[PDB]
Design a binder for this molecule. Sequence first.
Ligand SMILES: OC[C@H]1O[C@@H]2O[C@H]3[C@H](O)[C@@H](O)[C@@H](O[C@H]4[C@H](O)[C@@H](O)[C@@H](O[C@H]5[C@H](O)[C@@H](O)[C@@H](O[C@H]6[C@H](O)[C@@H](O)[C@@H](O[C@H]7[C@H](O)[C@@H](O)[C@@H](O[C@H]8[C@H](O)[C@@H](O)[C@@H](O[C@H]1[C@H](O)[C@H]2O)O[C@@H]8CO)O[C@@H]7CO)O[C@@H]6CO)O[C@@H]5CO)O[C@@H]4CO)O[C@@H]3CO
Lengths: 293, 293, 293, 293, 293, 293
Amino acid sequence: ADSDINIKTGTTDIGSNTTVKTGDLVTYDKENGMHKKVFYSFIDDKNHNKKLLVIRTKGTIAGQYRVYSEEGANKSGLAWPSAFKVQLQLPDNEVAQISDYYPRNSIDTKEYNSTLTYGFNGNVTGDDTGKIGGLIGANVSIGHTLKYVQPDFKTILESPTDKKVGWKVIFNNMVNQNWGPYDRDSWNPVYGNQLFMKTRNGSMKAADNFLDPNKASSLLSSGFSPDFATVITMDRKASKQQTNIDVIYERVRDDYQLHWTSTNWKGTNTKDKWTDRSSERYKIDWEKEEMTN
Amino acid sequence: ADSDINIKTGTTDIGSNTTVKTGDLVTYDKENGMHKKVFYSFIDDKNHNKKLLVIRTKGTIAGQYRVYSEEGANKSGLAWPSAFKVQLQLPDNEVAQISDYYPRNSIDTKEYNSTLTYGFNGNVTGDDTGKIGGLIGANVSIGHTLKYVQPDFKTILESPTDKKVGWKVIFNNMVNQNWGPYDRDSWNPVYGNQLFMKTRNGSMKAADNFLDPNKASSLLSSGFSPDFATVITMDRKASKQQTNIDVIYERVRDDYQLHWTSTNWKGTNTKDKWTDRSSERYKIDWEKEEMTN
Amino acid sequence: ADSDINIKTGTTDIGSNTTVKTGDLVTYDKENGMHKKVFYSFIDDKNHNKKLLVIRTKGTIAGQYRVYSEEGANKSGLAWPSAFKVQLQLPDNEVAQISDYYPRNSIDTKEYNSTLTYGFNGNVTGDDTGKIGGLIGANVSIGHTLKYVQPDFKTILESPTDKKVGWKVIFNNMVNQNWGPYDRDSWNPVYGNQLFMKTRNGSMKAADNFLDPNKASSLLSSGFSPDFATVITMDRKASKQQTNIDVIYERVRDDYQLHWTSTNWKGTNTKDKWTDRSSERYKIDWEKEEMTN
Amino acid sequence: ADSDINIKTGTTDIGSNTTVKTGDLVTYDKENGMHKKVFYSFIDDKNHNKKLLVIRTKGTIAGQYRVYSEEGANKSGLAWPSAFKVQLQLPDNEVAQISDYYPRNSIDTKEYNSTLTYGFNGNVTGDDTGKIGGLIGANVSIGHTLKYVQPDFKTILESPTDKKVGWKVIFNNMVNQNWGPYDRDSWNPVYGNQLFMKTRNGSMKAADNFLDPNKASSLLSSGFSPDFATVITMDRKASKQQTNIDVIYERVRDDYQLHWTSTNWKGTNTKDKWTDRSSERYKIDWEKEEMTN
Amino acid sequence: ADSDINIKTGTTDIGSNTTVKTGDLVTYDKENGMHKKVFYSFIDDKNHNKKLLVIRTKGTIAGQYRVYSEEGANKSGLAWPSAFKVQLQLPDNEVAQISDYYPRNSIDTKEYNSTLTYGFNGNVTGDDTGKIGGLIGANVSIGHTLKYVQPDFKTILESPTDKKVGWKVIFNNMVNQNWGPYDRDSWNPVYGNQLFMKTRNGSMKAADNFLDPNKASSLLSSGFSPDFATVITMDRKASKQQTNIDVIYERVRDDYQLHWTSTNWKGTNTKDKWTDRSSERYKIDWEKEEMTN
Amino acid sequence: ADSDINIKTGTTDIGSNTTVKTGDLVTYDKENGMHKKVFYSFIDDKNHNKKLLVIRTKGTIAGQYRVYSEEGANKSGLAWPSAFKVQLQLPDNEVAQISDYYPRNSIDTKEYNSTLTYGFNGNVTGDDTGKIGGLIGANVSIGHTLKYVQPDFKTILESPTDKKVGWKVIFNNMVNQNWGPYDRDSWNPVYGNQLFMKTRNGSMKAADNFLDPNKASSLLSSGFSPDFATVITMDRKASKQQTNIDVIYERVRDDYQLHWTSTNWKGTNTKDKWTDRSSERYKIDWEKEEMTN
Ligand SMILES: OC[C@H]1O[C@@H]2O[C@H]3[C@H](O)[C@@H](O)[C@@H](O[C@H]4[C@H](O)[C@@H](O)[C@@H](O[C@H]5[C@H](O)[C@@H](O)[C@@H](O[C@H]6[C@H](O)[C@@H](O)[C@@H](O[C@H]7[C@H](O)[C@@H](O)[C@@H](O[C@H]8[C@H](O)[C@@H](O)[C@@H](O[C@H]1[C@H](O)[C@H]2O)O[C@@H]8CO)O[C@@H]7CO)O[C@@H]6CO)O[C@@H]5CO)O[C@@H]4CO)O[C@@H]3CO
């Protein structure tokens, strides 16, 4: 931080004494169930070597967790969001560049606990007949406990370039009615993957044996609201002061199936079964400082 | 945050050098027990590409946790709030759009603790006769603890569009006199769902064997106070500068019933038995910058 | 801090009453998969004995965790990032100096828990044949629990001089599907190093038995985004007011090999097998207060 | 705090309505591997009874943790930093005085847990022959658990006078691959001091059996970056308005030796074997309000 | 807090619209190893009923933990700081008064954990000879855990008057190499007081069996830095506008003696064997707003 | 909070654009060992319906923990502060009123931990003779833990009226050398009340068997510093613009006595044995805006 290097806070930040032009662009993709919103800001700071555009991709991608197929009371399928994605990309011959973005990938940590114990204990025994007994024994215990936090979904910054940047919020793991956690690869020789299995031996129809969406991650059903920012820089002398940028909102769905084995329920999960992609092109005009779609 | 992208804090925010028109609108629905209040704010920032309206839905929906039926003395039913809802909807022909909203769904997390342990120990017997014994043993343990928070109610942002947005505060689970927690599906073969059961074997009538509201989540009785914000954008060039919007407050009630088996109490819960819907039409005038109902 | 020595906050900071000249310079290295971005700030504060240039090295170095080789189906290798580095170097004939930098090395801590516990107990047994027999016993135990946090990667400031400075974010240790944590030297006689081993006895081919990137540190694949700052001072009277500086972005990759032993999977790790070095020269003009490349 | 004594916050602080003159002085000692940087600030506040100079000593002292000796494959020695020092000294004739400094020594704390627990347990036995048995026993136990944090290195303000002040960052203790923690006096009859011992009885050479620096405190190798402030005051009537002051950066290295005993590795540590002392004289001109070396 | 009584924050503080006169006075007492610094501030706020002088007593009192006594290879003495004191005193004739001071005494707390646990447990036996066994027992446990923090030294505000005020930072207790903690009265029938004992029975001179100062509170050695504030009020109409005040920095040292008992080390601690007192008279001129010594 | 009700923060606070008159009044009662200080602030905000006076009662009441009687080595009594009090009272005929005060009584809380655990365990014995048996058992355990903080002294706001308000800082309970905690009612059939007993069976003068004041709450000896505020309102039309108000500082002391039984020490505590009351009248002049005594 500036203070660590003996500099007045904010001194090197950009935007002071600059008339900032902002804008909101909302698009709703009915078929893909995605509310796409771009909030932009043109920052042409004259003490900065380039014009800047801050593009904030927000809105929300519906989870769309749902029973899609019910082919018999013994077999049913559930489609669910295993990944949400937002991507911005500048066409190959664009002189403008991707300069920054937030959030980014943070280093995860884990707490380690190592414990060593050992003790002693005696024991004088006896009975009515008169037998006087005794005992002496030692003991040693060594063990460790590993602690770490696991978000239901991971927010990851995809390897960016000067033309493209993106984030993917992927299903990590989840607790099912206090059990697990389970993930996309969880497997029980008897029950298979119990990720969204409501009951193991219940008697209802397969289509009714899936976990209640309210008892699972809210992102699965109601959806995820992106809140990403990317800064694009542009040379004032660049010959073409108009830039095109394509934005992808995406949802990757897995297929979780339940079938009755005549004795109990067994679940299966198939990865990236479906993919819903909504693309939108925005036009950036660095002279009028406006962004449209 | 702006700091992470080397930009002066608040540089890209909307509002500066703008006269903002605010307003308050209160409506009490007696039949539905809802105090409905709209706090609005027009922000027509000329450096922003569109007119903006921030609508904050507040007030409070009474819980109405009450004993409604009493078929005799050994059976009675309790009406309780399993969900509170607030929705705003723009008629499909409006050019104005829902651009943002808050709160949104946040990713839940859980803490995982893995523990491994190994031990050694010796034992040396004894007794008056002069018999000396021995003992050498080992042990291994591989247990793990899972930790997470469980709010009595979850605040969920429903999948929005550019015309409709809503929230639902749904009952999640609750503690009943230190036991449980219990939820809408809890089931014991003997006592059924004990969600709001005061006693297991009391000799009182059914109507008097429901948990005292003061010992349950206060939202169940006194109520929930929404505090949601919806942002609506409007083209300044739009021919029609008036917009209609409907705001709906709802309460979904479950039916928790108790009956005497002959030896103990047994409860059952019927989901979404009743639904109290309170809708209201508001007029938004982007030119006068006022909202009326 | 200033307040700790009775001095008004901010009093000794640099930057006040100074027009700061900032700039952004972006470079993408396709071959090495590195998005390199320099954010600089020239601070020529006249109450300071020197001109300053704050150089923030950001961008993102792709992790590139991937299977690079596979011989048959029982042998395969995985290239992964064990180190990410950023270095700045001023030529020996330069009069400009490296004055500060951030972050720096933090002093690690650990928590200690010492446990001592005494205990005694009485006992009395008996049978139908009226046999009375008591038991008196005692016990002690010394325990020690050690606690500390372990980041997946450590961020380290390398020993700087007045002409060179660098940082290295190195792989420390990582949790593999709840087990471990494992590091570059972990070794088990039967399984070898299980760092990125998916299964111990799986029947799939080697290339398919590597931990899924989504289930490992996000730096390994998507990558690491540097956020380091370098401060360079320049004498206003130096004959030469132009400085060249070389910035280097690197990725050191280890080679994690898996092979079937006819009975189970066994892995090995080879350190620093590959090094991707991306260097670029920038020109610093202290007079025009601009940096170019 | 000032609010505790009903005084407007910052009212007694120094620096308002004063032009502060600052400066940076960087020196790199190659022989001792020390990047030395002085950041000074002259505050001649006229409502203060004396002139003020704040000298911040920063830069970085390399750790220099390295294998220095190799006599065969059974013996080897490691040089490592047990202390990093920074000292400032005014020659005794100077009228100027050291008035303040930061950081200082803080009172350390510890947590105490007393656990008294009572216990009662009975029993009933009955073999398949009609024989009955009983058991009644009690138990008591008093446990104590001590908790406190131990930084790898302690940052200490040495006893100052009005002519000299200094800090010493000394090696405290450190975890070795989850064991320990070990310190400079750690001793085991078998392995001796295992402080930096990689393996107890590995087959490699002595020079290859030292802990990976990356697995040890980063200060040991990469180095320590001082961040100390010294405040010096000066009478305005002082006849002589120039002051000399020496600044010494120091590193004390221990000698850690490992030798093969023919059955297992044994470690030995020799304290303060080497001292690297880098001294430099600066000139303080209270009139020109500048510092020079 | 002002906001708690509906008053704008700071509305009540003293000092606004007032030119404050500050000063620094440094005195080094070599024989007593005390860096004594007074930082004062005169606040003559015309809207306040009296003149204010805020005296801050800082600097640092050297710890001086040392093996000063050596009476052969079986006897040695360590002199250590059991208390540090700072006192300010106005003569009985003075009209100026002590009005406020900081820090003050804070109410300590303790955490209480009351645990009650009980349980049952079945058990069936059976040898390959047809003999079946049974077992049924229960248990009850009642135990409490007391938790609290123990600073090495306690900072205490002595009972002030309108003429004198003072502080004392007294040794509380301390952890000795993972054991204890020990205080000034710790007594063991075999080892006596092990406060600063390094080994129970190591074979070395008595002068070498004392705890390394680096392994004990740094206040014992390097020293304590007072940071106490005293506010003295003066009536603007008082005949004499000059006040004398005596400031005393003091150190009380205990004597920790070690001696071999033919088999082990035994320790004793003598309280307040030495009291190092450093007093200095200062002159306060309320008309000139100057403090001198 | 103002923000919670959509109002600009601080918008409703009192004191803006108002000249505030403040003052200090110091009184030392040697007989009662009480430093009494009043810090007042007249706030006559013309946009507020009444004149306002903020009276801050501070200073400090000496604890006075002391051995007062010694009737032979087997008997001795200790006087200690079981309560400290501060009260302000306006004679009944005053039109001025006590409007607010701080601190107030806050709702205490506790943490509840209910643990449910059940398990199974198999076994198989054996003897070189050829016998092969086994033991199968189960177990259950319901245990709960209660957590809460217990300050040594409780700061309580006494029931106020519009003519009188007061606080009491009463002794709650205290840890005695890691045992207890003890309070005024603690009673042991063998030792009686051990609140301040140094040793249970110590062979020394009774007057020397009281706990060292440094090992007990510092309020007991050095004392408590009141830091209370009282706001008084006054009608501007009131015909009499002078108000009298008495401030009482008080200390209540218990009597803790230790007598040798013959085999051990036994303590006894007599509640509210003594009461030291220091009263003083102040004159409030709402026109001159000053407080005098
Ligand atoms: O009996 C003394 C103890 O009693 C009280 O504790 C009760 C507690 O307040 C209740 O909430 C409940 O606890 C349950 C807990 O809430 C559950 O989460 C679970 O616990 C698991 C842990 O979550 C999990 O991480 C792992 O735990 C391991 C630790 O992570 C690891 O650090 C180590 O623990 C050692 C401690 O580090 C060390 O300090 C020392 O602990 C002593 C305490 O510091 C001391 O205060 C006192 O504890 C009181 C406690 O304060 C009361 O509130 O004595 C302790 C001595 O043991 O030693 C620890 C042991 O080595 O190891 C642990 C175990 O591997 O696993 C656990 C489950 O095993 O379950 C809990 C039910 O036990 O009940 C407790 C007890 O009544």
